[PDB]
């Protein structure tokens, strides 16, 4: 089916308002960045706050958050369903 | 909500199997290319066949099919719901 986590072009502020209403930590979405056109941002509910990560790219075209590289957004998301997006607390991506 | 047209990483063959069953020209989806990691592919039903368009990116990261550039996939998609993706026929993007 289409990806439940891909929200297209929604402003950062709208993504935070929507994620802040979710019950579970790790609720998230991928949005097309409005500040850097062509870039994707991953917004994620962390307890009392919503954090935003830039989806970085390398010359090979890979996507990444820190150092492990992915051939697609879909692979990046799914990897983080099992490995935390945070170094200090265990936060896994969960569909809204 | 999430975009009805973003299918993440599904194979080109899967997009063809899905769209070939659609009854209307212009039924489409956007997927993450497996043969060109990091490229998006827009698959579209054209009557008889399913055509695959490469989503191109310019030096600033903007997206395009032919010449007009867009700040996100979402805007490229919406513009092609009323501007044909074909040069010889009028084929407008319609959600599956």
UniProtKB/Swiss-Prot annotation, chains A, B:
Q: Which part of the chain is the SH2 domain?
A: 5-96
Modification after translation is described as:
Ubiquitinated by RNF173, leading to proteasomal degradation and inhibition of the RAF/MEK/ERK pathway. In the nucleus, polyubiquitinated by RBBP6 at Lys-54 at DNA damage sites.
Coiled-coil-forming residues are none
Reported impact of residue 35 to N: No effect on the interaction with SOS1
Name the cystine pairs. Answer: none
Q: Where is this cross-link: Glycyl lysine isopeptide (Lys-Gly) (interchain with G-Cter in ubiquitin)?
A: 54
Residues recorded with modification N6-acetyllysine: 54
Subcellular location(s): the record lists: Nucleus; Cytoplasm; Endosome; Golgi apparatus
Signal peptide positions on this chain: none
Q: What does this protein do?
A: Non-enzymatic adapter protein that plays a pivotal role in precisely regulated signaling cascades from cell surface receptors to cellular responses, including signaling transduction and gene expression. Thus, participates in many biological processes including regulation of innate and adaptive immunity, autophagy, DNA repair or necroptosis. Controls signaling complexes at the T-cell antigen receptor to facilitate the activation, differentiation, and function of T-cells.
Instruction: Provide the family line.
Output: Belongs to the GRB2/sem-5/DRK family.
Q: What is known of its domains?
A: The SH3 domains mediate interaction with RALGPS1 and SHB.
Protein's recorded name: Growth factor receptor-bound protein 2
| Species | Homo sapiens
Organism lineage: Eukaryota, Metazoa, Chordata, Craniata, Vertebrata
Write the gene name: GRB2
Span within the parent record:
60 to 151 of 217
């Amino acid at each position: 089916g289409s990806m439940a986590w891909f929200f297209g072009k929604i402003p950062r502020a709208k993504a935070e308002e929507m994620l802040s209403k979710q019950r579970h930590d790790g609720a998230f979405l991928i949005r097309e960045s409005e500040s850097a056109p062509g870039d994707f941002s991953l917004s994620v509910k962390f307890g009392n706050d919503v954090q935003h990560f830039k989806v970085l790219r390398d010359g090979a075209g890979k996507y990444f958050l820190w150092v492990v590289k992915f051939n697609s957004l879909n692979e990046l998301v799914d990897y983080h369903r099992s490995t935390s997006v945070s170094r200090n607390q265990q936060i896994f991506l969960r569909d809204i």
